[PDB]
Amino acid sequence: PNFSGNWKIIRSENFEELLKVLGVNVMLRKIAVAAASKYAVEIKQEGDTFYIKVSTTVYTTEINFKVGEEFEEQTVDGRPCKSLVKWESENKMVCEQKLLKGEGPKTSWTKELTNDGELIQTMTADDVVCTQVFVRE
Ligand SMILES: *C/C=C(C)/C=C/C=C(C)/C=C/C1=C(C)CCCC1(C)C
């Protein structure tokens, strides 16, 4: 497939519950959920190599990886982790994360290109899954 594009969020579910599992207190949880309303994802994909830029109104960060090659990024609540992406199917990838320091919930994410031109991203902490849906700008 080709994940490349400028993606704008249209739907986000269970994000507060994910942040709660991660220990974020309620006021900052509500503020974070609001910020996810302007969540934008820019993807450049060349074969198995991905460049991903995640941005909100006031913050931007870049994730760079090749499928099957360990890299370092951060968890959803900002702790540094070692990550490894693999394909699950033609159009879906899954990333497993390992904390560099300390303990914490088991975290992962996925990206999927649907047949209807949507990008579905999920973020997981233990039993709670946040699902977010994007369309091309
Ligand atoms: C492939 C896509 C990835 C790894 C995206 C990761 C996105 C995040 C860790 C987003 C985090 C956010 C917050 C911590 C609060 C504000 C809203 C978000 C969703 C941008």
Curated annotation (Swiss-Prot):
<dbReference type="GO" id="GO:0005501">
    <property type="term" value="F:retinoid binding"/>
</dbReference>
<dbReference type="GO" id="GO:0005783">
    <property type="term" value="C:endoplasmic reticulum"/>
</dbReference>
<dbReference type="GO" id="GO:0005634">
    <property type="term" value="C:nucleus"/>
</dbReference>
<keyword id="KW-1017">Isopeptide bond</keyword>
<feature type="binding site">
    <location>
        <begin position="132"/>
        <end position="134"/>
    </location>
    <ligand>
        <name>all-trans-retinoate</name>
    </ligand>
</feature>
<dbReference type="InterPro" id="IPR000566">
    <property type="entry name" value="Lipocln_cytosolic_FA-bd_dom"/>
</dbReference>
<dbReference type="Pfam" id="PF00061">
    <property type="entry name" value="Lipocalin"/>
</dbReference>
<dbReference type="GO" id="GO:0016918">
    <property type="term" value="F:retinal binding"/>
</dbReference>
<dbReference type="GO" id="GO:0005654">
    <property type="term" value="C:nucleoplasm"/>
</dbReference>
<dbReference type="InterPro" id="IPR012674">
    <property type="entry name" value="Calycin"/>
</dbReference>
<dbReference type="InterPro" id="IPR000463">
    <property type="entry name" value="Fatty_acid-bd"/>
</dbReference>
<keyword id="KW-0963">Cytoplasm</keyword>
<keyword id="KW-0845">Vitamin A</keyword>
<dbReference type="GO" id="GO:0030332">
    <property type="term" value="F:cyclin binding"/>
</dbReference>
<feature type="cross-link" description="Glycyl lysine isopeptide (Lys-Gly) (interchain with G-Cter in SUMO)">
    <location>
        <position position="101"/>
    </location>
</feature>
<dbReference type="InterPro" id="IPR031259">
    <property type="entry name" value="ILBP"/>
</dbReference>
<dbReference type="GO" id="GO:0070062">
    <property type="term" value="C:extracellular exosome"/>
</dbReference>
<keyword id="KW-0539">Nucleus</keyword>
<keyword id="KW-0683">Retinol-binding</keyword>
<protein>
    <recommendedName>
        <fullName>Cellular retinoic acid-binding protein 2</fullName>
    </recommendedName>
</protein>
<dbReference type="GO" id="GO:0015908">
    <property type="term" value="P:fatty acid transport"/>
</dbReference>
<dbReference type="GO" id="GO:0001972">
    <property type="term" value="F:retinoic acid binding"/>
</dbReference>
<dbReference type="GO" id="GO:0042573">
    <property type="term" value="P:retinoic acid metabolic process"/>
</dbReference>
<comment type="similarity">
    <text>Belongs to the calycin superfamily. Fatty-acid binding protein (FABP) family.</text>
</comment>
<feature type="short sequence motif" description="Nuclear localization signal">
    <location>
        <begin position="20"/>
        <end position="30"/>
    </location>
</feature>
<dbReference type="GO" id="GO:0035115">
    <property type="term" value="P:embryonic forelimb morphogenesis"/>
</dbReference>
<dbReference type="GO" id="GO:0007165">
    <property type="term" value="P:signal transduction"/>
</dbReference>
<dbReference type="GO" id="GO:0019841">
    <property type="term" value="F:retinol binding"/>
</dbReference>
<keyword id="KW-0813">Transport</keyword>
<dbReference type="GO" id="GO:0008544">
    <property type="term" value="P:epidermis development"/>
</dbReference>
<dbReference type="GO" id="GO:0005829">
    <property type="term" value="C:cytosol"/>
</dbReference>
<dbReference type="GO" id="GO:0005737">
    <property type="term" value="C:cytoplasm"/>
</dbReference>
<dbReference type="GO" id="GO:0006355">
    <property type="term" value="P:regulation of DNA-templated transcription"/>
</dbReference>
<comment type="subunit">
    <text>Interacts with RXR and RARA. Interacts with importin alpha.</text>
</comment>
<comment type="function">
    <text>Transports retinoic acid to the nucleus. Regulates the access of retinoic acid to the nuclear retinoic acid receptors.</text>
</comment>
<keyword id="KW-0832">Ubl conjugation</keyword>
<dbReference type="GO" id="GO:0005504">
    <property type="term" value="F:fatty acid binding"/>
</dbReference>
<keyword id="KW-0256">Endoplasmic reticulum</keyword>
<dbReference type="GO" id="GO:0048672">
    <property type="term" value="P:positive regulation of collateral sprouting"/>
</dbReference>
